[PDB]
Amino acid sequence: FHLPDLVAIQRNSFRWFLEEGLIEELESFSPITDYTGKLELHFLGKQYKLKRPKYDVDEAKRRDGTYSVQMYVPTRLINKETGEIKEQEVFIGDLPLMTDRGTFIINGAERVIVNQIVRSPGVYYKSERDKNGRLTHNASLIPNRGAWLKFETDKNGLVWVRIDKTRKLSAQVLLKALGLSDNEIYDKLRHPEYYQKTIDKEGQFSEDEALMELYRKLRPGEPPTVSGGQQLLESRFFDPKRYDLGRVGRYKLNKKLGLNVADTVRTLTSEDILAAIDYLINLELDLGGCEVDDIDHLGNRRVRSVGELLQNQVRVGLNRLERIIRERMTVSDSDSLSPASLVNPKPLVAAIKEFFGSSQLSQFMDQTNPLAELTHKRRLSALGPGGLTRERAGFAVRDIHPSHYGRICPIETPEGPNAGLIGSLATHARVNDYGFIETPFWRVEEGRVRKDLAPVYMTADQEDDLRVAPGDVATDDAGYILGTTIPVRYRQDFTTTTPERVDYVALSPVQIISVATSLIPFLEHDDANRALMGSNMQRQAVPLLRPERPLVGTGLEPQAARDSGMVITSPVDGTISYVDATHIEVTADTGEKYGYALQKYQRSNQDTCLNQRPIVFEGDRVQRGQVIADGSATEKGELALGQNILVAYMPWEGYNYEDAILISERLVYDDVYTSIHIEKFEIEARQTKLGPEEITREIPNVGEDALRQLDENGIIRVGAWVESGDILVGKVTPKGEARDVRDNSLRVPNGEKGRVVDVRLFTREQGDELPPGANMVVRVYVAQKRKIQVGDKMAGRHGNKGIISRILPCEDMPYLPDGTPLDIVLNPLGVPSRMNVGQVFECMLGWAGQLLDARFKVTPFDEMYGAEASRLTVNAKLSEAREQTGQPWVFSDDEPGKIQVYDGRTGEPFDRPVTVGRAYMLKLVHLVDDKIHARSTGPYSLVTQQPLGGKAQQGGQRFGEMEVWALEAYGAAYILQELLTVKSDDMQGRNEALNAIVKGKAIPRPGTPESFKVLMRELQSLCLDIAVYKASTEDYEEDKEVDLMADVNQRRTPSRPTYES
Amino acid sequence: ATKDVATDLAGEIRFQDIVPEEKTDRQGNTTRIAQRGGLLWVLAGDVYN
Amino acid sequence: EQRFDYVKIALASPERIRQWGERTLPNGQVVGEVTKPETINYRTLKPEMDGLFCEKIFGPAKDWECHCGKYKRVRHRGIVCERCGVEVTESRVRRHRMGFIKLAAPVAHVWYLKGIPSYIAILLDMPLRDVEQIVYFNSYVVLNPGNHSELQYKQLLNEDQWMEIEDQIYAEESDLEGIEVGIGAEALQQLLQDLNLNEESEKLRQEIAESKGQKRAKLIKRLRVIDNFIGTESRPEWMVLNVIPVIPPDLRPMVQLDGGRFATSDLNDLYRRVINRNNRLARLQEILAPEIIVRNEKRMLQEAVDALIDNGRRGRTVVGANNRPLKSLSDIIEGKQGRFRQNLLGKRVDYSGRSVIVVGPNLKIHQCGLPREMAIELFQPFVIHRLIKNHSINNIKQAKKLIQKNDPLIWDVLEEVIEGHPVMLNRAPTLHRLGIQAFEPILVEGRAIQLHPLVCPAFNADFDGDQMAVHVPLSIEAQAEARMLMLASGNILSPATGQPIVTPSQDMVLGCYYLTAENPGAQKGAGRYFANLEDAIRAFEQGSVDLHAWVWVRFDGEVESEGESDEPESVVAADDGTVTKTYRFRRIRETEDGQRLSQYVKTTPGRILFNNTVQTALIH
DNA sequence: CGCATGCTGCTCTACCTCTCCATGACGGCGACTGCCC
RNA sequence: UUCAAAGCGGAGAGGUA
DNA sequence: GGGCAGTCGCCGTGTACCTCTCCTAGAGCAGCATGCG
Ligand SMILES: [Mg+2]
Ligand SMILES: [Zn+2]
């Protein structure tokens, strides 16, 4: 495993921004001059004097603040004529800093900046076919930032140019306006008669008329001017402030067109335009060395990370700041000025705040467990400000290209509207300084693999002329390739060649998949859809009370846990002198002391615990690189997300039906599958125009039976058990109406209970920053322990999901020929129609490992060594376990994987033996305590007077129009009318219905719902004369307009139904 | 339907029985098709660009 | 006996728009006009006296309370205060009253100018570009070309053309009496007022009678529009606005965020812009300002009213705080998230819940399992009624306190409340009418709904994360109708095709196949004779024969064997004329030219079990 | 020993214009527009 | 005799079936 | 005039539920900490 640091895109991007990303933007804007040319401001953007953060990472986390630094740039103000130079240092802004794990802490929340896959700058050729016409070719020139250029060839052999989105115009105007005589554009072109046709058809242009026509076409309605056209061209293409190719754009232009222009120049020139026209002509005439481009190729696509996006935001803010400076500098006649009083850092601060808090590229961190956290930083998105849109992305962008091999995982994606639009970086891939993904290979000389010669990294376009072999080819002594035919890839195709003709070999068999998919053993025996499901579901598991390693791990577990930064390893090779639940100390051989402090029962973004525990004992010999303490989701060193339990494959009496799960009662009282969840509640004391708000225990209309656990200051005490509807902090507001205070103290929401573990509180006159108009802030933390129960979701690593439907006492479960009852019974109907054959291999190997105490490790794609390696290894292990244990019922030769099982209810054996084993199962975050909701009557909407929606605010269930169609097909008329009026928005019929039900009478007839009246008012407000009419009875009488907005019954109509008494 | 072939080696091209004929149309003004149909040979030798 | 019979729509005249607002008061003046753009007072949360939230126009904010606070009590009915003139009544009337805004200059309705069919252009016999140029102050139009040679009615002039014509008309030398009128404003009111629909229709008919060519469809469209306006007795000039209405203030409310900040609607900004521009233009017209600035103000007012009616239809979108567009009056009704499809054709309802589903065997079809924590909430009024009537409590407050305290009597009452009361269950993508069905509930312990395995294919349900919604019917008609039309035990066939829909599907078919199959091995007890099927079942139940053995049983009935030989075999003509024909699977014994004496069938104990089960279910 | 100046919080109102914020979707249907008889 | 203090709109991102 | 190809702009593109974050610029006015002789 040659795997380097897994999270290195973020670190490299931020280091680049700090080193040479801010300097380049600060020094491209420095010389700000006014129109008289008397005063100058210079920003010596090379020092930056970064000030150390005032708060640590932990202080920022626990205070709910921001982890950042301050930027200071030196400036000088120069007055012309009279020599006067003033020097000073100005405050520019606050830059949030990146933590040691690659994330940011904004307002006390962990955030991550996502990487974006975009199209690379350069020139792209395409051929389009008319319905009846010939093939016509067009070329598009696209910069990093600026205006786009387009060339097109017509059906008659004419060349046309389009700038941005103006009208089309012949290339002769553009080439003459640029300042080129006929002889040079005749010499540079390879086939001059093809352009001579255009010259003859469109008429020769001189410079003057070329600029005249260019101005006329670009900006119609204004009088043409030569200087106008000159300025227009200079501002359009030749201005560094308005046009930028980039380093990558220049590189791509030089690589394709075969030019030699310098790398420092980043604006368009004449040679590029001449070469693009020549290439278009040659492509039209089939010269031989020309070819159209593919836009989905990974050689035409780029990756942008936090450095580039922050650079763009800084550039925008700096432009606004320069506008303000120029406006302000001229308002004063006498100087009386300093560089400090000239710059205003408000626009830059605002731009940075908006990027880091409200952008759609900065995302709330996924933090359920270390695996989800690790894979959230290696994600690639095709959407955002500068990419695609959901309605425009189609079938071609969501597919798999043959150039993704070893660079993007072909398995891990979402299901639904986001399928194919978010991807994951592969295991060995890395991004170079241009923005292209690379992957490593070993060299092959004369059929010999040189495993001692520094593997080479290659991009998608480089490895198209070479013959590259897969990573599963077998060698005899880490040397010559065995076999006579070898699969290779040549120009995005699969072929076979003799092994004296291959060029490179992939490093490892798992080079093609990601980190989440690399943790599934026996993967090559699974379907791809279920592999997707299992990889996705591995990131929704919950850390358990006592974690445990798998018995059939794959070998990558210790590396997927070292990046989350929760495992402590000793750098010492010494002795341990002090161990405690919160502190560890290790002493070297006369090499001072090393002390570590451990986090205890903290909280993640998704309300899960973040504990840390020690492993070692006092006075222990310790070597370097040895694990000393570990986190909440790791056993010693490696990831541990689930548990090993006894499983049998057979149907029960209907409790296994269609993915349901039947478990035992041992998993409940043995505290298997129990977890800790911590929640946070907040209250704010503000001030009002009526008066201030006070936090106190003198709450009105409350008895001493509801103030037991308050601390005579109005705040609950640590260690108290709180049930639903219990006061946490007591507050009174100064209402205007004797006693003039009202009670709105905060209480726990319905359905929450647990212990109070922290009551940290902040106030003014103590050094704490608070939002304006507020006096104090109180935060309360409540913890609870949850057990497995009927309705929870369980999962395995091979894609098998399920919902628990029964929990049997242990005397009802089937038992083994030694008396041991099983732990879980699974249905065998779900295996053959979905093709998860790897779970049976895993179960059998876990059975053998339990009986041997061995803990095997198997790497994916293990059949390059034999014809059937997995079956042979499992059979040999089971036979060895049978011989070592001494019990003959463990393994049978007639039915290898099956043993006899009895019935716990009657004691009679089942007719045929069944498959039993040890399975590694996980508990997911979808728990039934968070999915049950009910309502009778509650709050209503303000405009439409319909019930509110939402679990957190006593919301109702929506009855859409498909359900209305279903009720219409039944012939139902009264259920529908009761649903539409009495139970939704008939403002007077609701109370009447409720009172009739309580009293026991009949429910009266309804009226007209309020939404119809709202719609009539809205239509009337659009100057439409709409009304409802009652027809005339007799002949010549007129129809009478009915007034809906007038109740005739002068009876009570409250806003919400109320009980009479 | 159409299908394009590609050479597996580098060298010079020798015709055996193929007589080209420039067949012009509304689309392929430079499409020179075959007329007889024979064998195309590729003599070996490295090629410098 | 219903309130109304039909709905009618038409064009709104300025008299009607002013009549919607402009109510009267027991004094000598009317109140219903909005004149200032202030919405609310900053210092105190109160509305101003002439604004978008006024109380003289739209009604009091607090019921039976006046603005100054002098009046109160429900004793005061239909009497208006004196210090501020605010009527004292309920605050609900605030979502009825409308008000209006009077424009200092006429503007055109954007629906009748910028449409896929444009009706102003059709009526005026002009292309859309020319009308759009006359509006927005881009060109002039001639209203009377009298006493001239190169000027025609409804001809678009220009600034230079108007100047050169002015150079001749103002000389007043000769041949130019009866000064021609040109007007660079709209003047659409004058052009539409000049229409004489009756003779225009007569002329159009006279022309359409003769000659057709291929492009008389234009005259047909013109005739259709003219006939519509004649029949409806409307006026075309009503398409140009002179007053506009204002929506009642509860349909555009002010909401307060958590930190004390206000989140005002998008309609308030548009109304404020319209009112500010109108007031500024009126002020400029008062001072007799130069005309070239008055025209700019008029164009800006046109654009403002257009952006209020429909944003981004003709010109440029109006952006607000961010670079996102504001929501106009047409965006409320037109979209997928508009009023029609979101609030009228589907709504949120009361007495409803949702939860996860698990499998329940031992349930009968037409039964479901409802958790005890949802039933006590969905069935609250019935529980209260039963507590008051039997187990005499007192009042409603005591019953609610009893429910809150969780008395043991609550569950005893609930169990008898819910029996005989059907409940409707629903799943998310309702693709046909079998996605909603009615069941009878049984109280279960836990937090998941139990669903019968035989109804899963109808719902397309599955026990790996699916969720279901629960609704209850309230009245007698709804209950009777749910029991008689929707119950899950009367949904045997499908409406798309008459094939059965409730059949054993996955694990029951496997069990039946195993039970009724055959096994060459494990055949203990083969070749044993039994009398009737119950004897064979009793012999198998206490282990003496295998489940797959071949046994002879005595069965007088109808048999249907597979791989049968329809031709009689091994006919043995015995003594006394008795014939015993032996087939492959039967041993019929018949009398001489007569009826049947006995029959035996060679079968398997599992087949006997299957068939006895079916027969017992049918006969009982 | 005392005097002069930048920073922070609250309040109060008003809106128009660009270098245009994009130039990777696809089909259907109706209304201008330049060109050839 | 009176009720009464807990409900709010929009935008973006992700997920389950 | 008749008849177009060609082009520009508007209409439309699954249902139900859950979690998180953030929400108008500019200018005017008044009161407290800080370096100096
Ligand atoms: Mg499912
Ligand atoms: Zn009053």
Handedness of CA C76, C81, C85, C91 (dihedral sign): negative
State the burial class of residue A624 (Cβ atoms within 10 Å of its Cβ: 0-12, 13-18, 19+).
exposed
Which residues are paired to A380 by β-bridges?
A115, A423
Assign A145 to helix, strand or coil.
strand
Angle ∠(A594,A597,A603) on CA atoms, nearest 5: 155
- Identity (one letter) of the amino acid at A75? T
* C-alpha distance from residue C388 to each of C381, C382, C391 (Å): 11, 10, 7
Residue A958 CB lies within 7 Å of the nucleic strand F: yes
Of C9, C349, C495, the CB nearest to A979: C349
Residues 6+ apart with CB under 8 A from A873: A845, A858
Instruction: List the CATH number of the domain containing A125.
Output: 3.90.1110.10
How does DSSP classify residue A981?
Answer: I
How many A from CA of A479 to the centre of ligand 1? 51
- CA dist C438 and C491 (Å) reads 11
DSSP C139-176: -EEEEE--S-SS--TT-EE-HHHHHHHHHHHTT--SS-
User: How many C-beta neighbours within 10 Å does residue C505 have?
Assistant: 13
Q: Which ligand is nearest to the CA of C84?
A: 2
Q: What are the φ/ψ torsions at residue A142 (nearest 5 degrees)?
A: -125, 120
**H or E element in which residue A530 lies:** helix A528-537
Which nucleotides of strand F come closer than 7 angstroms to any CB of the protein?
2-3, 10, 13-25
Of C513, C610, C596, C605, nearest to C553 by C-alpha is: C605
User: How many C-beta neighbours within 10 Å does residue A846 have?
Assistant: 23
Residue the block writes with tokens 């089937």:
A814
Q: What is the 3-state secondary structure (H, E, C) of A908-974?
A: CECCCCEEEEEEEEEEECCCHHHCCEEECCCCECCCCCCECCCHHHCCCEEECHHHHHHHHHCCCCH
A654 and C373: CB-CB below 8 Å?
A: no
C512 assigned ligand-binding residue: no
A286 and B30: CB-CB below 8 Å?
A: yes
How does DSSP classify residue C251?
Answer: G
Assign C44 to helix, strand or coil.
coil
Chains C and B touch (3+ CB pairs under 8 A): no
Residue the block writes with tokens 């097109």:
A152
- CA dist C103 and A207 (Å) reads 55
| Token output for A248 | 């990558």
B29 and A285: CB-CB below 8 Å?
A: no
- CA dist A951 and A227 (Å) reads 67
User: How many C-beta neighbours within 10 Å does residue C362 have?
Assistant: 9
- Identity (one letter) of the amino acid at A858? V
C346 and A963: CB-CB below 8 Å?
A: yes
Of A540, A823, A434, nearest to A664 by C-alpha is: A823
- CA dist A977 and A965 (Å) reads 13
How many A from CA of A804 to the centre of ligand 1? 14
- CA dist A537 and A555 (Å) reads 20
Of A134, A285, A286, the CB nearest to B26: A134
A859-885 as b/e, with b when 16 or more CB fall inside 10 Å?
ebbbeeeeeeebeebbbebbeebbeee
Inter-residue contact A432 to A10 (CB < 8 Å) = no
Shortest CA to C1' contact from A387: nucleotide: D24
* Greatest extent of chain A over all pairs of C-alpha atoms, in Å: 117
- At how many Å resolution was this determined? 2.9
- CA dist A347 and A316 (Å) reads 9
CA A281 from centre of chain: 45
Angle ∠(A979,A982,A987) on CA atoms, nearest 5: 135
| Token output for A915 | 């498959």
Which residues are paired to A923 by β-bridges?
A794
- CA dist A168 and A230 (Å) reads 19
* Greatest extent of chain C over all pairs of C-alpha atoms, in Å: 149
* C-alpha distance from residue A866 to each of A395, A863, A873, A987, C334 (Å): 40, 5, 11, 77, 67
Residues 6+ apart with CB under 8 A from A523: A517, A531, A838, A860, A861
| d(CA A659, C1' F14) / Å | 26
Of C260, C40, C46, nearest to A687 by C-alpha is: C260
- Say what the alpha-carbon torsion angle A199, A203, A204, A210 is, to the nearest 10 degrees: -110
| Token output for A894 | 């007639």
Which nucleotides of strand E come closer than 7 angstroms to any CB of the protein?
4-9, 11-17
Instruction: List the CATH number of the domain containing A776.
Output: 2.40.50.150
Chain breaks of chain A after residues with C–N above 2.5 Å: 737
* C-alpha distance from residue A648 to each of A667, A914, C463 (Å): 16, 7, 19
| Token output for A293 | 């481009």
Nearest CA distance, A255 vs chain B (angstrom):
16
C269 assigned ligand-binding residue: no
CA A1048 from centre of chain: 58
Q: Which ligand is nearest to the CA of C461?
A: 1
Inter-residue contact A539 to A797 (CB < 8 Å) = no
Residue the block writes with tokens 């402590």:
A568
- CA dist A406 and A512 (Å) reads 4
Assign A329 to helix, strand or coil.
helix
* Size of chain C in residues: 620
Assign A759 to helix, strand or coil.
coil
Inter-residue contact A806 to A768 (CB < 8 Å) = no
Assign A836 to helix, strand or coil.
strand
Tell me how the structure was determined. Answer: cryo-EM
A497-530 as b/e, with b when 16 or more CB fall inside 10 Å?
eebeebbbbbbbbbbbbbbbbbbbbbbebbeeeb
Percentages (nearest 5) of helix, strand, coil residues in chain A: 25, 25, 50
Handedness of CA A757, A762, A768, A773 (dihedral sign): positive
Q: Which ligand is nearest to the CA of C357?
A: 1
Q: What are the φ/ψ torsions at residue C370 (nearest 5 degrees)?
A: -105, 130
Of A192, A127, A198, nearest to A160 by C-alpha is: A198
| Token output for A747 | 């209480």
| d(CA A739, C1' D24) / Å | 68
- CA dist A748 and A750 (Å) reads 7
| Token output for A923 | 């508990």
Of C489, C496, C503, C468, nearest to C369 by C-alpha is: C468
| d(CA A392, C1' D26) / Å | 9
Of B49, B4, B29, B37, nearest to A286 by C-alpha is: B29
Inter-residue contact A123 to A295 (CB < 8 Å) = no
| d(CA A774, C1' D10) / Å | 14
- Identity (one letter) of the amino acid at C213? G
C329 and A949: CB-CB below 8 Å?
A: no
- In chain C, residues 414 through 443 whose Cβ sits under 7 angstroms from any atom of nucleic acid strand F: 428-429
User: How many C-beta neighbours within 10 Å does residue A735 have?
Assistant: 14
CA of B31: which chain A residue's CA is closest? A286
Residue the block writes with tokens 């222009």:
A261
| Token output for A206 | 């001189």
Which residues are paired to C3 by β-bridges?
none
CA A267 from centre of chain: 35
Handedness of CA C412, C416, C419, C422 (dihedral sign): negative
Of A132, A133, A285, the CB nearest to B30: A285
Of A18, A625, A718, nearest to A307 by C-alpha is: A18
* C-alpha distance from residue C475 to each of A1005, C13, C413 (Å): 11, 46, 20
- CA dist A544 and C51 (Å) reads 61
- CA dist A880 and A854 (Å) reads 12
* C-alpha distance from residue A892 to each of A90, A585, A822, A898, C518 (Å): 82, 53, 20, 7, 26
Residue the block writes with tokens 């169609």:
A965
| Token output for A663 | 């478990």
| Token output for A838 | 């790897």
Of A135, A285, A286, the CB nearest to B27: A135
Q: What are the φ/ψ torsions at residue A105 (nearest 5 degrees)?
A: -120, 100
C68 assigned ligand-binding residue: yes
| Token output for A288 | 């031989």
All residues of chain C having their beta carbon less than 8 Å from the beta carbon of residue A971 are: 485
Beta strands in A744-886 (DSSP E): 746-747, 754-758, 761-763, 774-786, 793-796, 801-808, 824-826, 856-857
* C-alpha distance from residue A495 to each of A406, A487, A491, B46 (Å): 18, 6, 10, 23
Which residues are paired to A692 by β-bridges?
A687
State the burial class of residue A102 (Cβ atoms within 10 Å of its Cβ: 0-12, 13-18, 19+).
buried
Of A353, A242, A355, nearest to A308 by C-alpha is: A355
Residue the block writes with tokens 């899950």:
C488
- CA dist A980 and A1001 (Å) reads 21
Of C406, C459, C607, C394, nearest to C519 by C-alpha is: C607
- CA dist A103 and A113 (Å) reads 8
C81 assigned ligand-binding residue: yes
State the burial class of residue A322 (Cβ atoms within 10 Å of its Cβ: 0-12, 13-18, 19+).
middle
- CA dist A445 and A504 (Å) reads 9
DSSP A832-900: TTTTB-HHHHHHHHHHHHHHHT--EE--SS-TTSSSSHHHHHHHHHHHHHHHHH--GGG--SSSTTEE-
Of C181, C117, C187, nearest to C146 by C-alpha is: C181
Of A917, A921, A919, A920, nearest to A848 by C-alpha is: A917
Which nucleotides of strand D come closer than 7 angstroms to any CB of the protein?
9-18, 22-26, 30-33
A289-313 as b/e, with b when 16 or more CB fall inside 10 Å?
ebeeeeeebbbbbbbbbbbbbbbbb
Q: Which ligand is nearest to the CA of C67?
A: 2
- Identity (one letter) of the amino acid at C16? R
Assign C230 to helix, strand or coil.
helix
| d(CA C404, C1' D13) / Å | 52
Q: What is the 3-state secondary structure (H, E, C) of C305-362?
A: HHHHHCCCCCCCCCECCCCCECCCCCHHHHCCCCHHHHHHCCEEECCEEEEEEEECCC
Residues 6+ apart with CB under 8 A from C70: C81, C83
* Size of chain B in residues: 49
Inter-residue contact C488 to C502 (CB < 8 Å) = no
- The tally of CA atoms less than 13 A away on the side-chain side of residue A199 is 12
| Token output for C421 | 């009361």
**H or E element in which residue A492 lies:** none
Of C140, A196, A807, C519, nearest to C151 by C-alpha is: C140
- The tally of CA atoms less than 13 A away on the side-chain side of residue C115 is 12
**H or E element in which residue C119 lies:** helix C119-124
Which residues are paired to C142 by β-bridges?
C182
Structural domain boundaries enclosing A741: 675-786
- CA dist C19 and C17 (Å) reads 5
| Token output for A588 | 């070297």
List chains adjacent to chain C, taking adjacency as at least 3 C-beta pairs closer than 8 Å: A
Handedness of CA C440, C445, C449, C452 (dihedral sign): negative
Shortest CA to C1' contact from A930: nucleotide: F18
